[PDB]
Amino acid sequence: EVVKFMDVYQRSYCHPIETLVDIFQEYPDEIEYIFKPSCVPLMRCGGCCNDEGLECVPTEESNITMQIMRIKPHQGQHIGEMSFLQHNKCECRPK
Amino acid sequence: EVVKFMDVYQRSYCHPIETLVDIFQEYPDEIEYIFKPSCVPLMRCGGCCNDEGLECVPTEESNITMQIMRIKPHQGQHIGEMSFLQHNKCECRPK
């Protein structure tokens, strides 16, 4: 049945939401390893703003540490800690 | 606390996840109008398959109806119903 307007509106407005993030996006300089899993669940800003000229962006952020399987193709693999940024608070700011 | 590898691995794996989707994306023929909210919360496949040849895609889908404010800028606006696609089940498939 039908999702009411104010429910849609409040649920979609700019806020941190669990987002599955590719590790290569987080570590864009990495060219030596591949990773399992290849993506991680992180809280990141998402959703929309009242004014279409605005973007939902973080105003507070902090790192979380996750164990990732770090693989060097044809050589080996190791469980290692890697840090990932999470968004704690978000606001609507100009595009 | 450090997130353990098997916890990261299981939570990142291909599954339906709440995703904030721009309405204009879903409906590029809706040129004439503005929408509030401009995006909606939808269950969509997300996450990783850990085989760069495989991607996470829907194998079961359904529709959901939501109340959305349709706006003709500086002219008028009306709360109407719009239907969106959701993903109920996902699997890892070749790209």
Swiss-Prot record, chains A, B:
Keywords: Angiogenesis, Cytoplasm, Developmental protein, Differentiation, Disulfide bond, Endoplasmic reticulum, Extracellular matrix, Glycoprotein, Golgi apparatus, Growth factor, Heparin-binding, Mitogen, Nucleus, Secreted. Disulfide bonds join 14-56, 45-90, 49-92. One of its GO terms (biological process) is positive regulation of cell adhesion. Glycans are attached at residue 63. GO terms for molecular function: chemoattractant activity; cytokine activity; extracellular matrix binding; fibronectin binding; growth factor activity; heparin binding; identical protein binding; neuropilin binding. Induction: By hypoxia. Regulated by growth factors, cytokines, gonadotropins, nitric oxide, hypoglycemia and oncogenic mutations. One of its GO terms (cellular component) is Golgi apparatus. The keyword Disulfide bond applies. Higher expression in pituitary tumors than the pituitary gland. It is linked to Microvascular complications of diabetes 1: Pathological conditions that develop in numerous tissues and organs as a consequence of diabetes mellitus. They include diabetic retinopathy, diabetic nephropathy leading to end-stage renal disease, and diabetic neuropathy. Diabetic retinopathy remains the major cause of new-onset blindness among diabetic adults. It is characterized by vascular permeability and increased tissue ischemia and angiogenesis. This is Vascular endothelial growth factor A, long form. It comes from Homo sapiens (Human). The chain holds residues 219 to 313 of 395 of the full protein.
